C-alpha cells in the first residue's frame, strides 16, 4: 500500500478513553483506497518525536472499512495527528 493522502482525513469518533487505559479513535478518509494511515502524536516541547505507542498495528484504510486507531500516550500535553488531521490530548497521570 501507499500512504494515505494526509489532507483527506476527518474525525468519525474523536480521541477518547477506551476504558482499558488506552486512547481510541476513528477516522474517515476521502482519498485513494486502500492506503496506509500516517498516525503519530507529539508532546509539547518535542515537535520531532512520535510519542504515540500504537496498539493497532499498521492501521490502514481499506475499501470496505478501516480507520479505527488505538494508542497509548505519555503523561502531559500531546497532540494526535492522523495525517494532518489533529486533536489535542492531555494525558493525566504518570
Amino acid at each position: 500500500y501507499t500512504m494515505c493522502d494526509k489532507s483527506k482525513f476527518a474525525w468519525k469518533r474523536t480521541p477518547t478513553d477506551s476504558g482499558h487505559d488506552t486512547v481510541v479513535m476513528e477516522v474517515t478518509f476521502s482519498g485513494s483506497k486502500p492506503c496506509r494511515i500516517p498516525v503519530r502524536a507529539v508532546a509539547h516541547g518535542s515537535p520531532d518525536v512520535n510519542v504515540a505507542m500504537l496498539i493497532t498495528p499498521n492501521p490502514t484504510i481499506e475499501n470496505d472499512g478501516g480507520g479505527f486507531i488505538e494508542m497509548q500516550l505519555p503523561p502531559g500535553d500531546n497532540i494526535i495527528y492522523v495525517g494532518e488531521l489533529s486533536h489535542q490530548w492531555f494525558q493525566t497521570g504518570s
Partner: antibody
Amino acid sequence: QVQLQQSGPELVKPGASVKMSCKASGYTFTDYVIGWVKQRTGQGLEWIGEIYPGSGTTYYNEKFKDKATLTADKSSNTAYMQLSSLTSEDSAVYFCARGEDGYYIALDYWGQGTTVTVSS
Amino acid sequence: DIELTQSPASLSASVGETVTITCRASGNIHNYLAWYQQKQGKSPQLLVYKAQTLADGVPSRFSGSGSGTQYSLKINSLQPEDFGSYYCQHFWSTPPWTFGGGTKLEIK
C-alpha cells in the same frame, strides 16, 4: 505537455442519456485523479465528483450521485462520465480536470469542456 | 459542508493598477485553497494552490495569502489578459470540494 481532450457536444432530447470522455496524454494516467465540474451558462463552477484511475476509488457530490457515473479505462488513458435522465437543468458545460493522487490540493490542468444542450 | 464566499461579486479596474479579492470559508480549511482564472468561453486556469503557491507559469504580480477561514488574492499591475472570473476552491479533509461563487474582474 499535459493534455486532457474532451469529446464533442451533445444536443439531446429530455430523458436521454449521454456518455462523454476525457482522454489524457502527456503524463502517467494512474498517478492523477480526474475530477468533473459543471458550469451552466453565465454561472459558477460546481464539483460533480472524481475518480482515481489507479485504484478505481470514486467520490460523488451528493447532488449528483443519482445523475453522474464516473469510470476510467487505464489501457486507453481515458476517463468517462455518463449522465442519465437528462433535463434542461443538465444543460451546461462539463469539464474534466487533473489533480495529484496522494496530495490532491488543486485541479491543475483542465479539459476544454463538453457542452450538453437538452432541447426539444 | 464548507461554504466559500467570494468578495466582491464584481469589480472594474484599469491596466497597471492593483486589486484585491477575497475568499472566506465557513470552517477552517488549513490553507487548502486554490485560485483559478477563467476567461469568457475558456477553461479555468490554476493560478494559486495551498493558498499562496503560484502555479507554473503564473507571473509574480499575483500573490495569494491568508489562513484559517480568510484568504486573499492580490493582483499587482493589472494586465489586459487578467480579466475574467476568478474562483476559489477548497480541498480540506472531506468532499464536496466546493467552489466560491466567483468574482468577475472587468478591465475598465
